[PDB]
Amino acid sequence: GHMSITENTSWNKEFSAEAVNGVFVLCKSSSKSCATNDLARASKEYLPASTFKIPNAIIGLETGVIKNEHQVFKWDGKPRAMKQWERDLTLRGAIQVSAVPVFQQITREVGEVRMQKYLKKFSYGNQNISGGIDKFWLEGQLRISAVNQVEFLESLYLNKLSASKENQLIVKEALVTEAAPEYLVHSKTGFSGVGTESNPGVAWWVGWVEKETEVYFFAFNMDIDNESKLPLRKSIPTKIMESEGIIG
Amino acid sequence: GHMSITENTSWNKEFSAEAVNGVFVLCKSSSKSCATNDLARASKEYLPASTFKIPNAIIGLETGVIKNEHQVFKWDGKPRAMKQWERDLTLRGAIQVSAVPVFQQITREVGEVRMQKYLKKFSYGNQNISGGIDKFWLEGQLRISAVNQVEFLESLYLNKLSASKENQLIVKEALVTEAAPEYLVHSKTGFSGVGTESNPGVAWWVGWVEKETEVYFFAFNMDIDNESKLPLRKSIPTKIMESEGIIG
Ligand SMILES: *C(=O)[C@H](NC(=O)/C(=N/OC(C)(C)C(=O)O)c1csc(N)n1)[C@@H]1NC(C(=O)O)=C(C[n+]2ccccc2)CS1
Ligand SMILES: *C(=O)[C@H](NC(=O)/C(=N\OC(C)(C)C(=O)O)c1csc(N)n1)[C@@H]1NC(C(=O)O)=C(C[n+]2ccccc2)CS1
């Protein structure tokens, strides 16, 4: 890439106030104007968890495993790890409620060869898909940094991923999470569970904010060993952006 | 063709409770299952006012007058009728604040001949562009019915207009007005003025609502001779959609 990134450790106070280890990366306009609380962690690769839905959906559409933007994913009737997943879902619905089994099925149908090819085209992390075709991003070896998430998202925002513009637009449509006349947020959450206290889990929030004629890309991750701390994955980024002029 | 529509006069309740003459057309899934409070008014053509920004944006992109979805429409610093228009705007921003001068400039560049052609391809209303390029949707002869709006919007939803899929997708993202995990609204307003008591203006609200795996298309218009009545263009459709269990 061509990222210019500045460490601003004053951003650490939002983390230390909550007794949390993580990083926030925030870029205005492009990856040529970025800042983070922690340069080292910004470039450190973690398990993507549900953030992998963004590339998975694009790859689904590119390969034709997902037939089109209007496809419904029907619940077969058999139980699932969350109740919110026990229903028929659109592409957007599945992404928004973060329905893992829908996406495990897409990936099985895609196959390792095509998966491997596309993660190379997207420069997605360490591009290591071993661990099982249906769980490399969930408990396998695939890892990605906050910096790389931002680069990836920027490419998607600009329709520069190696995929049709149509497919990128379909997925961007699925990622909208807040809409107002001159304020638009596209975003995706992730959470791997609580791991242990020796080896904590990871929580993510990644996306971008449009406000007037500006765009801001962001990626946040944190170590999480306690499910009660999970709200911080939005409140910390929100507070940093408030203090910068974005959400405030 | 192919619309099936039912008159349900119980929907007149919300209209007469506010002393308003108007029509609501609501369709579930497709134009094969529609209902309205007034069949004759459903098919009557009125000037589209700011709802014309939907086709106008598609045509802008199709002819290359709008370069892409990231184009910024710069303000020249000279007065505009609305304070909210006195700033640089994205395409989505210009649509959402209904920035008439941005779209007048788009229309001027498109020209009469190209405008005519796309209104024909879209079956948009009486397809009448007479009066001069500086007035037809405004001080002009173009008129469209609520039924024809619902047909137009269904085509757009299905990416079936005669326009690239990517241009239709661009315009759809510009139209999003509420986003939640399993509830998505795309909508546009219009208001032509107060006219006279004898010749009222028109106000519109058109769009569609995605809920779970269903879609509902809607178009509302009403006669308006008093600006204080304007909010009814949202509250009356809202009430009817609530009573049908949609607004959830
Ligand atoms: C589009 O429907 C409206 N455009 C018009 O240009 C007309 N406006 O008439 C009013 C605003 C009443 C006036 O005093 O000029 C018009 C005249 S002849 C014709 N065909 N159209 C825009 N609509 C609109 C609204 O729907 O409420 C406006 C106010 N908003 C601005 C920003 C956000 C929401 C609403 C401004 S013009
Ligand atoms: C995708 O990142 C999320 N993760 C999972 O499905 C995984 N674990 O989910 C648990 C531990 C919460 C569970 O028991 O269901 C998982 C394990 S290892 C791995 N890579 N993923 C979905 N995301 C998500 C979120 O990102 O916030 C959810 C929110 N949530 C969690 C718990 C309680 C209420 C809401 C749902 S799971």
Maximal C-alpha separation, chain A: 50
Answer whether residue A17 is part of any domain.
yes
Answer whether residue A181 is part of any domain.
yes
Write out chain A residues lying below 8 Å of B96, CB-based.
Answer: 181-182
Cα(A204)–Cα(A111) distance, rounded to whole angstroms? 26
Cα(B192)–Cα(A103) distance, rounded to whole angstroms? 47
How many other C-beta atoms lie within 10 A of the C-beta of residue A146?
27
Domain that holds residue B19: 5-243
Q: How many domains does chain A have?
A: 1
Answer whether residue A247 is part of any domain.
no
Helices B53-62 and B100-110, packing angle to 10 deg: 40
Answer whether residue A124 is part of any domain.
yes
Answer whether residue B15 is part of any domain.
yes
Three-point CA angle A159, A174, A130, nearest 5°: 75
Answer whether residue B248 is part of any domain.
no
Nearest residue on chain A to B71, judged by CA atoms?
Answer: A213
Give the N- to C-terminal CA distance of chain B in Å, as an integer: 31
CA distance B50 to chain A (A): 15
Of A70, A87, A179, the CB nearest to B177: A179
Tell which A residues from 124 to 183 touch B, by Cβ distance under 8 Å: 158, 165-166, 169-170, 172-173, 176-179, 181-182
DSSP three-state, residue B142? coil
Q: How many Å is the Cα radius of gyration of chain A? A: 17
Candidates B22, B34, B236; CA nearest to B151 is B34
Query: For residue A23, what is the enclosing H or E element?
Result: strand A22-28
Answer whether residue A248 is part of any domain.
no
- Residues 6 or more apart whose CB falls under 8 angstroms from that of A210 comprise A183, A184, A185, A216, B90, B92
β-pairing, A89-90 vs A72-73, is antiparallel
Strand segments, DSSP code E, in chain B are 5-7, 22-28, 34-36, 72-73, 89-90, 176-180, 183-191, 201-211, 214-224
Amino acid letter, B67:
K
Half-sphere exposure of A170 (CA within 13 A, CB side): 26
Cα(A137)–Cα(A161) distance, rounded to whole angstroms? 20
Q: How far is the CA of B81 from the centre of ligand 1 (A)?
A: 10
Answer whether residue B191 is part of any domain.
yes
Q: How far is the CA of B192 from the centre of ligand 1 (A)?
A: 6
Question: Would you give the DSSP letter of residue A144?
Answer: B
Half-sphere exposure of B232 (CA within 13 A, CB side): 23
Residue contacts between A and B (CB atoms, under 8 Å) = 62
Ligand 2, pocket residues at CB < 6 Å: A 47, 49-50, 81-82, 98, 100, 138-139, 189-193
DSSP three-state, residue A169? helix
Contact A97 B166 (CB under 8 A): no
DSSP codes, B219-242: EEEEEES-GGGTTHHHHHHHHHHH
Contact B181 A87 (CB under 8 A): no
- Residues 6 or more apart whose CB falls under 8 angstroms from that of A248 comprise A241, A242
Q: Which structure tokens are listed for B132?
A: 């001069």
**CATH classification of the domain holding B103:** 3.40.710.10
